[PDB]
Amino acid sequence: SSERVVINISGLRFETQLKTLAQFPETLLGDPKKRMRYFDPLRNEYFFDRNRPSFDAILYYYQSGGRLRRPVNVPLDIFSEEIRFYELGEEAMEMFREDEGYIKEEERPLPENEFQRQVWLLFEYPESSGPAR
Amino acid sequence: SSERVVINISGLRFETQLKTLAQFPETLLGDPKKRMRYFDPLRNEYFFDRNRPSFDAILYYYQSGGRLRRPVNVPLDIFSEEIRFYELGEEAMEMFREDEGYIKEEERPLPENEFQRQVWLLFEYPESSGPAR
Amino acid sequence: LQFYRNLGKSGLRVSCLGLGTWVTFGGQITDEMAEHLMTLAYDNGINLFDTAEVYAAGKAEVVLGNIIKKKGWRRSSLVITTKIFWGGKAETERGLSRKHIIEGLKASLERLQLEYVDVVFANRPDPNTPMEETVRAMTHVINQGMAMYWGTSRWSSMEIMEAYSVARQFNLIPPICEQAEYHMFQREKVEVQLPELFHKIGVGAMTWSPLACGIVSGKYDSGIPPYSRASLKGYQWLKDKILSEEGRRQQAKLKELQAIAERLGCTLPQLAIAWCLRNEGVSSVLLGASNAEQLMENIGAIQVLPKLSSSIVHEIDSILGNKPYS
Amino acid sequence: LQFYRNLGKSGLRVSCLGLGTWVTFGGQITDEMAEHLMTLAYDNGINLFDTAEVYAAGKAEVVLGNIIKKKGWRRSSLVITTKIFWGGKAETERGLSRKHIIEGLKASLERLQLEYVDVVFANRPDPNTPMEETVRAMTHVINQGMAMYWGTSRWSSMEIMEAYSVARQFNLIPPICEQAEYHMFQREKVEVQLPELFHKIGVGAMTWSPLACGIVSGKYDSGIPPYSRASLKGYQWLKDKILSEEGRRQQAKLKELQAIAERLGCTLPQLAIAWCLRNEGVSSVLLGASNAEQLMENIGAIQVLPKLSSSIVHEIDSILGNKPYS
Ligand SMILES: NC(=O)c1ccc[n+]([C@@H]2O[C@H](COP(=O)([O-])OP(=O)(O)OC[C@H]3O[C@@H](n4cnc5c(N)ncnc54)[C@H](OP(=O)(O)O)[C@@H]3O)[C@@H](O)[C@H]2O)c1
Ligand SMILES: NC(=O)c1ccc[n+]([C@@H]2O[C@H](COP(=O)([O-])OP(=O)(O)OC[C@H]3O[C@@H](n4cnc5c(N)ncnc54)[C@H](OP(=O)(O)O)[C@@H]3O)[C@@H](O)[C@H]2O)c1
Structure with missing residues (x-):
């Protein structure tokens, strides 16, 4: 209309x-x-x-x-x-x-597996643990 | 309302x-x-x-x-x-x-005591006296 | 549950059932009866009576008008309405031009022996008249004290909204009601188009022919009874309808509805009328009646209303198979 | 100090005291008395008389109307007001719909044997009627010469402001006065809510029951006198009030006020009435009186007014202990 x-x-x-x-x-x-x-x-x-x-x-x-x-x-x-x-x-x-x-940053792929996540986090995020740092 | x-x-x-x-x-x-x-x-x-x-x-x-x-x-x-x-x-x-x-400059602390003020003024403000200058 | 309700969002309070005068007054029934019908209705709380310049060439207004005068009812206890479009054989005696609205309403008022009507209606839309002219004429008759309010009959939502916007544009009075046909076999306008208007601009619906002229009563399950509207001289077209293939289908659906009626402990006419009132958007249903028995039965529709649960309503919709898509 | 004042900010000039007709006219007193009361008041400069369609089922208007006709007073020297809400037993005979405002005012005018009233009031707010409809109806009766102005009775500030804005929106006429209850035991609306309206949109207050129906007169210090309003058939509720725990507390506070009255050299009724007039926002106080003695005494409140100094006013507030928080 x-x-x-x-x-x-x-x-x-x-x-x-x-x-x-x-x-x-x-x-x-x-x-x-x-x-x-x-x-x-x-x-x-x-x-x-x-x-x-x-x-x-x-x-x-x-x-x-x-x-x-x-x-x-x-x-x-x-x-x-x-x-x-x-x-x-x-x-x-x-x-x-x-x-x-x-620009969309999209999303970051995740390990799912408990171990990889456990590890990947202190090898690419110093943020993740005081140890990661 | x-x-x-x-x-x-x-x-x-x-x-x-x-x-x-x-x-x-x-x-x-x-x-x-x-x-x-x-x-x-x-x-x-x-x-x-x-x-x-x-x-x-x-x-x-x-x-x-x-x-x-x-x-x-x-x-x-x-x-x-x-x-x-x-x-x-x-x-x-x-x-x-x-x-x-x-940025607020706040305020400048003051001597109060007559003497310090008298002195401080010609040691940090050339403005304060022709002598200060 | 409340017998009385606001006509749309206006301050005018009408009973949820009103009595119309089409076909009957000054036509099919004897004024002795007409008086009887009104008396009966008025004594039962019905305060709304609808008529039109076109019914029986003006005699319906004359009869209605006489009864009110003879009974002496207080004018303030009544809500009289009249609808204007076809007022004469002459070219200028029909339509919603300023000339015909003023002249038509004035002549109805004279036949009604009334100072004014509560609501004057435009009996149908007028393509040949600018909305502005119509809205200014209606506003004029209200300011002249010839009517308290005005409404539209048979208009589309688009037109009703146009009247409303034209009214706001020129500081005129918007219509407060649309008089729409509504019954189990004509649901589209009321259940799909009018609700928006009700919530948006306050226009309410005052529906007519809730028994589709008697078709929904069940009285035609076996043919055309004698003295039924379908048998009157001039009403063949109704007769053709009933007997048509579509008519047959309706009558068959009515037999299915009868079971609903018995479940609810009421007659089909009562169910049909109460069904029209299940939704807030409908302010009142105008009934038709050729004798006192019919009216006394139809008024009982008010007792049915509280029983129309969603489930029942669903069941009916299934029987009908014509629920309009929103 | 000035006997006459503007009703709100309108150009209508009223005496600071008016005479009402609730309970008395066509009811508790004999028309011979009623004539006496009006005559007495008119001769004393009082030009304001208030009535309502509801008082004594319309007889108050009939009596008031007869006196004015019998005395021959010039209509232009009087300010007659009438208030409309409950005009009948029928559904459409009550409220502020356009239908009832026009019909109710027209019937009051007929009972008053008057062409018009100076101010027509809405006797109370109407939740069931759009403000626009009410404001257009009031504006209509004014344009028809049925009233000179209109006002609201018993509305909230919010509603009064809504009427005013609706009036500005549609180029209609705003109300010029609110008729609010006001006395030493009902101070909240006048002393907290209405002043803003007075200064902002010019609406003034015309207060009623300045003696809280006689309660503030002191006449009930010892029980319910015979022939007092509290003893009338139909006025039990008042009786229950007086005798209640709250009633007792009031009467005790009245004994404290008596000393103020003597300090000011006046009677309690005079003090109570003058107190209502201490603030500019109040244009006039409507008095009630069942005999000539009462009226002659109450009119003396005007001599007290100049003595209400801040200090006295403070003292009273302390005695009362009910000064509303601004
Ligand atoms: N706005 C418009 O354009 C417009 C158009 C048409 C009508 N209307 C209004 O709506 C009103 C009602 O319309 P309507 O007459 O068509 O209504 P309806 O309710 O559809 O039909 C009423 C008719 O059905 C029969 N009837 C009613 N109750 C009955 C019962 N319990 N048992 C058996 N038969 C019964 C009667 O006819 P018989 O006894 O003769 O069979 C009666 O005259 C009119 O009078 C008028 O005021 C408005
Ligand atoms: N806007 C509204 O909704 C509204 C509502 C109510 C009233 N009003 C208006 O306000 C007017 C006045 O109200 P009101 O009658 O309640 O007023 P009031 O001043 O509170 O009470 C007057 C009554 O108290 C008694 N009285 C008055 N002066 C007295 C005196 N000097 N000594 C002893 N008793 C005395 C009389 O009753 P007794 O002699 O019978 O004891 C008299 O009828 C009404 O008539 C009406 O016009 C308006």
């Missing part, structure tokens, strides 16, 4: 089409049930008592069809929280980090 | 929940008696004829629960004034400075 949705971010007014939000339905804004909580029937708007600067990027992510660029003026820690909040999902988050210069 | 408070900063409209402000009650906005002066009963908003850019940081400080980051676009002298204005308190101010790269 092209029915218009008004999202009020701490007083800063945003408007978009419902079909722009519906595009991603796993998200807070894209899911009727999740955003219901924030609806103000007196003013016909969803209200969020949240950081203002971050939002355009969040909205543009829907309008652009996937572009999640952090605004230059917004700290990476505040933005990432906002992303978490609006539930944009792990994919968007990863791409965002990657583009932000953070 | 979740009763909504509208703060108008030189025309730029901000909204938050009263419980977000009540969080810090020593502050101008958090104290009913202090902000009363700025209330416009015709429009149901508090009006401040004050610098606009600085505010989000000020509001975000309440929403974040303590984060006081100066906006990149705002001069440190104007922001610190705004902080002073809204009465965020000496703690927030110090953290802010520190994070801003200003």
Whole structure:
């Protein structure tokens, strides 16, 4: 639909089409049930008592069809929280980090066997034991 | 409460929940008696004829629960004034400075005794006397 | 469990059952009966009576109006509603234009011998009239004291939301209720589309034809009884329905439901009506009745309501096989 | 010191004392007396008279209305108020829905034989009605010329502020007054919650039962006198109060206050009433009186007011031991 949705971010007014939000339905804004909580029937708007600067990027992510660029003026820690909040999902988050210069370290393989773990830990982690040190 | 408070900063409209402000009650906005002066009963908003850019940081400080980051676009002298204005308190101010790269010099120990002061001043401050120089 | 409930989220309190006047008043039954039906219903706590400019070409309003005047009931103890769309043969006598809403409501009020109705409805959506015009007209009649509230009949959720947003945009009054068809064989709108609206903007449902005009009563298990609505002149289309292949399938499903009714110790009409009330989103069910016996039986649906456990509801859904996907 | 004052920050000027009609008019006293009381009060500058749809099932309004008509006083010299909540036995005859506000006010106006009241009140909050609906109904009756202003009775500050914000949101009219209970044994709302509202949004207080129905008069120091409100049929609950352990404690505190009264050269009723007026936030105190003597004495509270110095006020607070924490 092209029915218009008004999202009020701490007083800063945003408007978009419902079909722009519906595009991603796993998200807070894209899911009727999740955003219901924030609806103000007196003013016909969803209200969020949240950081203002971050939002355009969040909205543009829907309008652009996937572009999640952090605004230059917004700290990476505040933005990432906002992303978490609006539930944009792990994919968007990863791409965002990657583009932000953070490389996943993945995970480190584990011995499982009690002995190897016992040994491997003091031969590669001085951290693991005072003896390892 | 979740009763909504509208703060108008030189025309730029901000909204938050009263419980977000009540969080810090020593502050101008958090104290009913202090902000009363700025209330416009015709429009149901508090009006401040004050610098606009600085505010989000000020509001975000309440929403974040303590984060006081100066906006990149705002001069440190104007922001610190705004902080002073809204009465965020000496703690927030110090953290802010520190994070801003200003280290407290604390205070310099004083002799008290008239003689030492008399002497110490011309042996460590050339400033203190023409003779000290 | 509570006999009375809010119409949507408005402050208007209606009984969970109301009495309608379609087909019956000024038509199939004699005004002596009509008075009897209303009297009976009013004495049983029912405060909601629904009519329309279109029923019997206005005579339903005249009869309803006369009874209220003759009985002397206090106007404040009643919730009268009327629905407007088709008010005349002339081009300008139908629709939701400002002209027809004002003129149609004014003429119904005259036939009802009433100063105002509690809720005025748009009997169906109007593609030919801007929402703004309709919403301003409804808001107008309310401000003129011709109605206390307004609602939509037969609109889609999308349209209902459009009326609501148009109302917020222009500082007008939003609708507070949608009058939707609802019974065991027509579940889709009430159980899938209206709930969101109820929770989001407070619009409640006031459902009609809870017995699908008598079809769900079980009275048609063996053919078309004499003097039944299906046998009335003008109601052939109903007759065609019952006897159709789909009609047969319904009647067969009704035989399955009878066992549920007996389990719950009630009659099928009572079960059918109570079923309509199992969900909060429905504010009231408008009943139809051609005699006093029917009304006295149908009112008993209120005793069934507490017994509709999830399990029973599941069982019914299985019998019906038509539970809409959310 | 000023006899007249603004009701809150509105432009409506009322005497600091008004005369109510609960229990008395159309009930405990004879209309001959009622006329006498009003006449007496009006001749003494009192321009405020308060009533309600609920008092004596509407007869209080009928009696008050008759006196005004019989005396011929200029309507513009009076400030008549009426309070609406419980208007009937029927479900739709109570509450703050749009239906009941309009119908209730219209029926009171008919009983009062008046075109309009100066202030219409919501006799108590209504959890079952959206604020928007109530505020739009009140605004409606004002625009229809049925009332000049509206106020809330028995609401919390939170609710009063909600009405005010809802009013600003929809461009409606905010309430201008809250009718709160206030006397030496019920201080919390007026002295802690209402002042903010007075300074912030201009809502003033119009307090009732300044003698806690007679309890604070001292007339119950020795038991329940004959013909006292506590002895009336229907007012046992008051009787239970007086005689209760808490009642006894109050009466004992009243004996302590008597000394204050003598210091100030006045009677206890006069002191009690003047005490209610010591703070700006209170616009007017509604008095109750079952005979002319009581009224003539109570009006004398105005002479006491200038003597309530901080010190006296402190002394009282100590005697009372119930000064609420700000
Ligand atoms: N908003 C709209 O567009 C709209 C549209 C249609 C109706 N409505 C409203 O909804 C109201 C009710 O609709 P409805 O008349 O179709 O309701 P219904 O409950 O589906 O059917 C009522 C009819 O079924 C029969 N009946 C009822 N109880 C019975 C019982 N216990 N045993 C046997 N037969 C029984 C009677 O017909 P017979 O005795 O003649 O067989 C009666 O006239 C209307 O009057 C009107 O107010 C609104
Ligand atoms: N907003 C609300 O919900 C609300 C609720 C209650 C009342 N009110 C308003 O407030 C008005 C006043 O309330 P109220 O009647 O309770 O007031 P009050 O001042 O507490 O009590 C007045 C009663 O006390 C007695 N009395 C008064 N002066 C006396 C005196 N000098 N000596 C001895 N006894 C004396 C009389 O009763 P007896 O002579 O019979 O003993 C008289 O009827 C009402 O009439 C009504 O307009 C509003």
